[PDB]
Design a protein around this ligand. Sequence first.
Ligand SMILES: Fc1ccc(CCNCc2ccc(Oc3ccccc3)cc2)cc1
Ligand SMILES: Fc1ccc(CCNCc2ccc(Oc3ccccc3)cc2)cc1
Lengths: 319, 319
Amino acid sequence: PTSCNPSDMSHGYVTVKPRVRLHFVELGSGPAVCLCHGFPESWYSWRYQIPALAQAGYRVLAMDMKGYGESSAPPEIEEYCMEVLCKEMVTFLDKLGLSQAVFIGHDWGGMLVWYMALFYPERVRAVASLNTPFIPANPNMSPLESIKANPVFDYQLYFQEPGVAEAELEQNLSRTFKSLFRASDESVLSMHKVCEAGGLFVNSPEEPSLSRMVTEEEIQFYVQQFKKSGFRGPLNWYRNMERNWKWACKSLGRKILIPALMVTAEKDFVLVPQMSQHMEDWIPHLKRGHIEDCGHWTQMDKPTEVNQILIKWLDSDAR
Amino acid sequence: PTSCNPSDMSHGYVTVKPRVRLHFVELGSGPAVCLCHGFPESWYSWRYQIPALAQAGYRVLAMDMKGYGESSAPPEIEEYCMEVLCKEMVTFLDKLGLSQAVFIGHDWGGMLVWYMALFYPERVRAVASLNTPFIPANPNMSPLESIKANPVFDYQLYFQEPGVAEAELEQNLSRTFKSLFRASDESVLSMHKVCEAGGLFVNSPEEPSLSRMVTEEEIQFYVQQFKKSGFRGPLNWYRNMERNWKWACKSLGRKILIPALMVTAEKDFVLVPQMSQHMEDWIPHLKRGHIEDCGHWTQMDKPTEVNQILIKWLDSDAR
Ligand SMILES: Fc1ccc(CCNCc2ccc(Oc3ccccc3)cc2)cc1
Ligand SMILES: Fc1ccc(CCNCc2ccc(Oc3ccccc3)cc2)cc1
């Protein structure tokens, strides 16, 4: 599928707060579709979707989320809680003069678009998440109790204290992204042996091989971007579990009423399909997509399939 | 009417050639409307139109034309001929993934959108010019002969040799813009005594008064921008008369077929309404607007009237 050359794009910048400006890439005409990547990614993670959606009749805005790439990376950890992040995206729409947009996210980005749909449905024409499900906040279950429940979520504990995961992730960026951006069958990480035996990459190859999903050129683009601000800002998306929990609790007792799409990935072994089992009771107008042989990095892994699911869903529920 | 605060806008950048990048301001959703200012202006000259068009259902892209503001200002004089300028605007659309846009221009910008309509009608949904008429090139009349015919066009002779007009225009920028941006009844310039008696401002007040059209704050914004690249780039739009003439001649014998609007200003004493007298024979689907009591700086002078004319015309001929 057609990808993007970064220098052949239109680049947009919007100031949402005094020292915070968001950067995005824009292509196409028609209804606005805002794409929100996950950790640790970039607008470039949507490179196979951007020209496909534009060609289908949509105006695509692919974000560099806060902390990433050309967007500002404020130092404070609380700048990366979901409450602040969502209101900045509302300001973003305001500054662009957009009454609403379609929101499509993946990973942390998918969590963000769910909460955009939940607290600002007025500004969200339609919402779609890849991998990330919407589970209502349990006001009786603290976040630490639920993380320290399912063992696959232990890498988030290693991500908590500032400076620790930054050091491992920044020490060699080419190794970091070549180790992460892999299909499920090529995976070199055990996300559970994380917090009692070194770190993320302690038992990974020092010079890992290049996944079938990516070229060397695409690895070096990610490498170049995370040389701008490093991994602190991206990691701070994990370091507000308790505030996100309290904020999410303030909405308990309301459903998401707008058109919605949930796309699950068979081989995403952390955000497993089954975690989405009962979103129908909270999201009455939910449509579904499901992709076989697809790991976590869904847009890179199965670009054709995701393109067909999104366009099919946009043409029937967003327009 | 609602204006714009510059820092509350979305700013876009597109690279159309190796050392040339165009800057624009963007607001709204709906059909694309590209606004192209004149000499010596800025995207800010459309400040009263941008929020009005967006509110009427249009996606506004207000350009900093080449040589101006935040857009690149290459040094070569030939970079500012109409042939190069128009193809860069085509590349601009390409990079944004826009099959076509509405083009609205004023002054030199209006000349540019006429030639966009003439050589690239496929990419122009509809075209509108304020003040600037479309007169077909006369292949028997050299440009110097026709300028040295009507005496009001003698300031263009003073603009020819590089460095001369730059010095007068840059010596005090606050004086330059306060002397230019005036209603017809407040005018301090005789554009004909230009080339045999000093220059543009030799018999103008050293500290001119502030026109009823503008505040001090708006003057200082123009002042701030023309501190970036100066007046050379803007002046170079006048220094390719013979190439524009030869290029325009290569199209003789064709009409402009697309929907079109010509807006004349009663008190524009250089681009007088009567210069547009016979554009109907070359532009069959031409609509007209006309604004009384309006000088050259049409968007600043009569903002309400221009807003009503454009929106009325867009809703019936562009959508
Ligand atoms: F190989 C890889 C590489 C990166 C990842 C990132 C996945 N993390 C996204 C995410 C989505 C929701 C989150 O909120 C919580 C928090 C606690 C419990 C349940 C949900 C926290 C993180 C996964 C595998
Ligand atoms: F007070 C002011 C301040 C600025 C201006 C600028 C007006 N100039 C725009 C323009 C439009 C077409 C042009 O092409 C020619 C060239 C020769 C003959 C006929 C048309 C040349 C310039 C006027 C009055």
